[PDB]
Structure 1
Amino acid sequence: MAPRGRYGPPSRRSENRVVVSGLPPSGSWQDLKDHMREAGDVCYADVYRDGTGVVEFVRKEDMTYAVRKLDNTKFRSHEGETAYIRVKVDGPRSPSYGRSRSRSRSRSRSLEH
Structure 2
Amino acid sequence: NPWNDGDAGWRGAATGARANRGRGGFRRGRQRVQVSGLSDETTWHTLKDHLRQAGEVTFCKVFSGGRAVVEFVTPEDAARAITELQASELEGATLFLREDREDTVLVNTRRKIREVRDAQLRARKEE
Smaller-chain TM-score bracket: 0.5 to 0.7
Give unpaired runs (5+ residues) of structure 1.
Answer: 1-15, 77-81, 94-100, 108-113
CA contact (8 A) 1:21 1:53 kept: yes
Counterpart residue type for residue 33 of structure 1: K
Q: Distance in 1 between matches of 2:102 and 2:74?
A: 21
Q: Deviations over 1:62-103 (max 9, x none)?
A: 112111111111123xxxxx211022212359xxxxxxx89x
Alignment of 1:8-47 (within 5 A): 16-47=31-62
Aligned Cα root-mean-square deviation (Å)? 2.7
Q: Distance in 2 between matches of 1:73 and 1:50?
A: 18
Structure 1 length-normalised TM: 0.58
Residue aligning to 1:91: 101
Aligned length: 81
Higher RCO (CA 8 Å, separation ≥ 6 residues) = 1
* Structure with greater helix share of residues: 2
Q: Distance in 1 between matches of 2:89 and 2:80?
A: 16
Q: Distance in 2 between matches of 1:85 and 1:75?
A: 8
Give unpaired runs (5+ residues) of structure 2.
Answer: 1-30, 104-109, 120-127
Residue aligning to 2:73: 58
The structure that has the greater radius of gyration is 2
Residue aligning to 1:12: none
CA contact (8 A) 1:63 1:89 kept: no
CA contact (8 A) 2:39 2:65 kept: no
Among all aligned residue pairs of Structure 1 and Structure 2, give the percentage whose two residues are the same amino acid.
37
* Structure with greater strand share of residues: 1
